[PDB]
Amino acid sequence: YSYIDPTQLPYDHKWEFPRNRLSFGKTLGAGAFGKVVEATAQGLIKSDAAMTVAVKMLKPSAHSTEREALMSELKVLSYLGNHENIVNLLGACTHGGPTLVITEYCCYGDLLNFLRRKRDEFVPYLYKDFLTLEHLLSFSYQVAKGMAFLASKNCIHRDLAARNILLTHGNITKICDFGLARDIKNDSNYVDKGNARLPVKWMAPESIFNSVYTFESDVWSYGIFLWELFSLGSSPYPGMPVDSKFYKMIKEGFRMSSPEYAPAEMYDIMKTCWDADPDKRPTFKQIVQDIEKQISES
Ligand SMILES: COc1cc2ncnc(Oc3ccc(NC(=O)Cn4cc(C(C)C)nn4)cc3)c2cc1OC
């Protein structure tokens, strides 16, 4: 929810695709109630050529709440329309069986696992495809541009992190949301807080203590994502478990020091994203303008 009720958004039937034209392959990811599988779609291209796609669907374990949530995701994707910095909708199957959501396939997978795999060969300054500082600045710019677009459409992400960014051809990043297709019960980055399992280390104080999610709380998460990026995939608040001492320290103003590979101007952005006053944080549009200047000066 937040600013817009996703259940009231319309679904354009121009997206309707016949489900008998899909051939399912390997499961890319699974949670308790949902999954994402790799598939071949036939007749999606005007010229009889087959194409590889990603398909999100529910498991027989899912209930009415999860069935409403997958339909709401489809309505939001149809409402947003395509954007270069967001995973794009290609089609959907809404009759003749369970809901299927068809999105573009991203050959390099999630950004978190890519950074961890590339960590040991990082170059701060050719066939080998080494990760450089130039690539980290470009990723930070592309993610801020996609988030500036979501905010302009009155959308709040609520789970922005490196694990929710995909990487495709030509070092292009795409904002995504695995949601129900992530096993949050066995992921240590999600913590038990009341009757929920939440990503506390990425959450703004107003979201933790008041359950308030806004344009400003997404900006706090972006600052945490920057720390993950310039630490080459390390977990935030290293050596600190999520306990009473953690919630106390955050309220009292404790903040992480800069990661090892962050330029000083990128750490300056992180600090402003983590201001206790939501009105003192920059907008995603201001972040884009700031990074643009850094890239041009480089
Ligand atoms: C080679 O490995 C992979 C390739 C992949 N290629 C493509 N997709 C993959 O997974 C998916 C991840 C997420 C989604 N769904 C959404 O993001 C829908 N959405 C967007 C939003 C917001 C508006 C931003 N809200 N909801 C669909 C598929 C892959 C996973 C891989 O490995 C794990």
> How is the chain split into domains, by residue range?
10-105, 106-291
CA distance 26 to 199: 28
* Residue listed under structure tokens 């709401």: 72
Technique used by the depositors: X-ray
Which residue type occupies 70? L
Minimum-distance ligand 1 atom for the alpha carbon of 56 = 27
Does the beta carbon of 36 lie inside 6 Å of ligand 1? Answer: yes
Which residue type occupies 192? D
Q: Is 183 a catalytic residue?
A: no
Which residue type occupies 162? A
Crossing angle for the helix pair 284-297 and 215-230, to the nearest 10 degrees: 30
Q: What is the resolution of this structure in A?
A: 2.0
- CATH number for region 106-291: 1.10.510.10
Phi then psi dihedrals of residue 76, to 5 deg: -65, -45
* H/E segment holding residue 71: helix 64-80
Cβ atoms of 159 and 220 closer than 8 Å: no
Crossing angle for the helix pair 264-273 and 284-297, to the nearest 10 degrees: 180
Does the beta carbon of 109 lie inside 6 Å of ligand 1? Answer: yes
Instruction: Quote the tokens at residue 276.
Output: 């206790």
Residue of minimum CA distance from atom 22 in ligand 1: 176
- Grouping H, G, I as helix, E, B as strand and the rest as coil, residue 101 is strand
Same fold, 10-105 and 106-291: no
CATH 3.30.200.20, applies to 10-105:
yes
Give, as one character, the DSSP assignment of residue 17: -
Contacts of residue 212, Cβ cutoff 8 Å, sequence gap at least 6 = 206
